[PDB]
Amino acid sequence: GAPPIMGSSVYITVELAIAVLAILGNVLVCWAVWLNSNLQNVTNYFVVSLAAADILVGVLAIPFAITISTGFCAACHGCLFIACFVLVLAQSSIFSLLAIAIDRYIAIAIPLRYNGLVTGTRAAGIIAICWVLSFAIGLTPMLGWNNCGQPKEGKAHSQGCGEGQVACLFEDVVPMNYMVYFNFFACVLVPLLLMLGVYLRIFAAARRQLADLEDNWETLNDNLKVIEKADNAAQVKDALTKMRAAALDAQKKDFRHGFDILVGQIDDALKLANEGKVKEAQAAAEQLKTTRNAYIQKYLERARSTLQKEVHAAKSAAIIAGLFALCWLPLHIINCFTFFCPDCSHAPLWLMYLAIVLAHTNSVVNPFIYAYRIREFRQTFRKIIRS
Ligand SMILES: CC(C)CCC[C@@H](C)[C@H]1CC[C@H]2[C@@H]3CC=C4C[C@@H](O)CC[C@]4(C)[C@H]3CC[C@]12C
Ligand SMILES: CC(C)CCC[C@@H](C)[C@H]1CC[C@H]2[C@@H]3CC=C4C[C@@H](O)CC[C@]4(C)[C@H]3CC[C@]12C
Ligand SMILES: CC(C)CCC[C@@H](C)[C@H]1CC[C@H]2[C@@H]3CC=C4C[C@@H](O)CC[C@]4(C)[C@H]3CC[C@]12C
Numbered sequence: 235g236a237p238p239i240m241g242s243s244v245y246i247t248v249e250l251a252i253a254v255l256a257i258l259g260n261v262l263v264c265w266a267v268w269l270n271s272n273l274q275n276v277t278n279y280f281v282v283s284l285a286a287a288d289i290l291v292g293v294l295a296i297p298f299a300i301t302i303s304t305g306f307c308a309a310c311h312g313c314l315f316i317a318c319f320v321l322v323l324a325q326s327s328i329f330s331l332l333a334i335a336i337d338r339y340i341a342i343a344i345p346l347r348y349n350g351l352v353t354g355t356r357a358a359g360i361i362a363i364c365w366v367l368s369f370a371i372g373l374t375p376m377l378g379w380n381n382c383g384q385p386k387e388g389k390a391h392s393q394g395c396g397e398g399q400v401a402c403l404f405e406d407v408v409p410m411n412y413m414v415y416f417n418f419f420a421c422v423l424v425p426l427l428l429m430l431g432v433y434l435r436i437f438a439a440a441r442r443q444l445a446d447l448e449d450n451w452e453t454l455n456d457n458l459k460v461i462e463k464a465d466n467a468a469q470v471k472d473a474l475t476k477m478r479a480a481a482l483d484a485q486k487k488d489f490r491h492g493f494d495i496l497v498g499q500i501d502d503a504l505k506l507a508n509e510g511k512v513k514e515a516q517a518a519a520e521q522l523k524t525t526r527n528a529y530i531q532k533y534l535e536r537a538r539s540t541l542q543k544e545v546h547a548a549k550s551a552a553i554i555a556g557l558f559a560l561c562w563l564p565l566h567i568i569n570c571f572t573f574f575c576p577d578c579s580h581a582p583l584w585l586m587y588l589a590i591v592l593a594h595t596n597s598v599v600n601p602f603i604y605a606y607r608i609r610e611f612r613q614t615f616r617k618i619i620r621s
């Protein structure tokens with residue numbers, strides 16, 4: 235049995251290094267949003283809320299984790315607070331991640347009403363509510379769902395603790411049925427699964443809109459060919475009405491002028507078609523190609539480019555949510571083994587330390603994801619560091 239202070243020294247040193255990086259990187263995120271108006275939007279207010287949770291992991295949760303690794307003597311409910319505080323920060327992160335996903339879904343699904351529905355003032359209120367709920371959920375053991383009524387008195391005596399004190403260790407004070415059923419299943423797993431459902435809807439909505447744009451583009455070009463090889467006015471009329479509906483569906487200044495020219499030219503040709511003048515209708519329909527080459531294809535390309543950027547932004551957000559799940563799931567899975575398999579030897583202490591370090595590393599990774607995936611953050615980071 236090697237001296238406990240040695241393996242402790244490795245765990246503590248790694249924890250302190252992570253805390254430094256979590257503070258530095260996420261302070262940079264907050265400084266960037268504060269300074270760049272192009273970064274000031276509802277999505278990034280939740281990003282800042284998430285960065286604040288990660289700053290508090292470095293300032294508070296990691297010092298608390300180091301403290302409760304020692305098993306020092308503490309009043310049981312004081313031990314409970316420093317043990318449970320990381321649950322507040324993890325819960326706040328989950329709420330911010332879910333809010334970000336929902337924000338991106340509103341933007342892709344109803345962009346015309348996004349600016350009227352999703353405002354900064356409503357966002358600040360949601361953030362406040364989510365922090366209150368995070369304290370309520372994370373500190374629920376302090377309301378009585380704890381093991382302080384049944385302390386490990388033999389462990390307390392062997393450490394010289396006073397009366398009312400326990401050896402302060404996470405699993406000795408926080409009940410495992412709370413950790414598995416309430417914290418993991420209900421408060422972590424269910425919101426992560428909801429997030430997965432939201433992102434599936436976001437990418438399904440984007441794929442559908444990028445299909446719908448190509449279908450309307452195909453309908454405009456296909457029916458142009460139908461008119462050229464038509465032989466009577468009724469075939470021209472049929473293909474023109476289909477073009478007119480495709481044009482109005484695709485419509486939903488230089489943008490409006492291009493579609494006004496298009497529908498007007500379709501109407502010009504339809505009037506000729508209704509009068510039985512096929513050759514004049516076809517010549518009129520040929521004028522549409524000039525409008526298509528100078529306006530309509532430009533709208534189709536820019537609409538595609540806007541959709542691709544929304545997909546890119548949703549993928550960046552989903553990566554962040556997925557990395558949260560990756561870094562936190564090992565701890566929750568270990569707790570499931572401890573709880574559901576009392577015939578299994580407890581996960582060894584080195585593995586507990588590794589799982590805790592991994593969870594804490596998640597508070598380091600988001601600034602790197604923003605830097606590598608969002609140009610506006612990356613360029614703002616560069617200016618902050620240079621200047
Ligand atoms: C403004 C912010 C930074 C203040 C942070 C205050 C923190 C560090 C304080 C608030 C409550 C405090 C705890 C309250 C009660 C106990 C029980 C005692 O037997 C050992 C210390 C312990 C566990 C305290 C440790 C420090 C503590 C967690
Ligand atoms: C920013 C300010 C307002 C934060 C206020 C938080 C204060 C009120 C809370 C935080 C944690 C709390 C402590 C947590 C646990 C214990 C140990 C218990 O045996 C006696 C009370 C005591 C010591 C609590 C007193 C109140 C306390 C210090
Ligand atoms: C993709 C990621 C999230 C999956 C992580 C899986 C990890 C957490 C799993 C895979 C194998 C698992 C271990 C398999 C067997 C045992 C022995 C048992 O006596 C205690 C738990 C313990 C030690 C498990 C702990 C959790 C464990 C390490």
Ligand SMILES: CC(C)CCC[C@@H](C)[C@H]1CC[C@H]2[C@@H]3CC=C4C[C@@H](O)CC[C@]4(C)[C@H]3CC[C@]12C
Binds near residue numbers: 563566567570571575
């Ligand atoms: C990751 C997402 C998709 C779902 C989370 C799956 C979790 C809840 C699953 C993955 C592996 C599972 C464990 C696999 C094996 C055992 C050993 C058995 O003696 C008791 C249940 C227990 C401990 C399972 C509990 C539930 C478990 C931890």
Ligand SMILES: CCCCCCCC/C=C\CCCCCCCC(=O)OC[C@H](O)CO
Binds near residue numbers: 238300304305389401
């Ligand atoms: C620079 C940062 C300073 C940080 C200061 C670090 C604190 C060091 C004090 C005690 C650690 C002793 C080693 C902890 C060993 C674990 C004890 C434990 O697991 O519980 C008790 C149990 O009885 C055992 O079997």
Ligand SMILES: CCCCCCCC/C=C\CCCCCCCC(=O)OC[C@H](O)CO
Binds near residue numbers: 297
């Ligand atoms: C920017 C500033 C923001 C706020 C910064 C706050 C930093 C908190 C640091 C450490 C918490 C460690 C607290 C635990 C120390 C417990 C040691 C102790 O209390 O030992 C005596 C006890 O009776 C055992 O026998």
Ligand SMILES: CCCCCCCC/C=C\CCCCCCCC(=O)OC[C@H](O)CO
Binds near residue numbers: 356363370371
């Ligand atoms: C485990 C503990 C769980 C505790 C469970 C109970 C908590 C209450 C729940 C939600 C409060 C929602 C607050 C709503 C605040 C008022 C909002 C408002 O007035 O604004 C309307 C706005 O115009 C629309 O856009």
Ligand SMILES: Nc1nnc(-c2ccc(O)c(Cl)c2)c(-c2ccccc2)n1
Binds near residue numbers: 324590
């Ligand atoms: N058995 C057990 N032991 N320790 C922790 C623990 C304590 C302090 C921390 O800072 C961290 Cl990250 C983890 C958790 C645990 C598991 C999932 C979610 C929250 C806590 N579970």
Ligand SMILES: CCCCCCCC/C=C\CCCCCCCC(=O)O
Binds near residue numbers: 243246247250251254
């Ligand atoms: C780009 C520069 C980065 C800033 C430097 C950050 C320095 C932090 C690195 C390691 C933390 C070391 C913790 C010291 C251990 C104390 C002794 C002990 O383990 O008990």
Ligand SMILES: CCCCCCCC/C=C\CCCCCCCC(=O)O
Binds near residue numbers: 297
């Ligand atoms: C920017 C402010 C950050 C706050 C600084 C906190 C850094 C202190 C590091 C670790 C916490 C020390 C925990 C002490 C354990 C007590 C050991 C014992 O009593 O047996």
Ligand SMILES: CCCCCCCC/C=C\CCCCCCCC(=O)O
Binds near residue numbers: 358359360362370
């Ligand atoms: C212990 C608390 C458990 C119940 C939580 C109650 C819900 C949160 C309570 C108060 C938050 C107050 C902030 C409300 C501002 C709303 C702004 C808005 O949404 O537009």
Ligand code: NA
Binds near residue numbers: 287597
């Ligand atoms: Na986090």
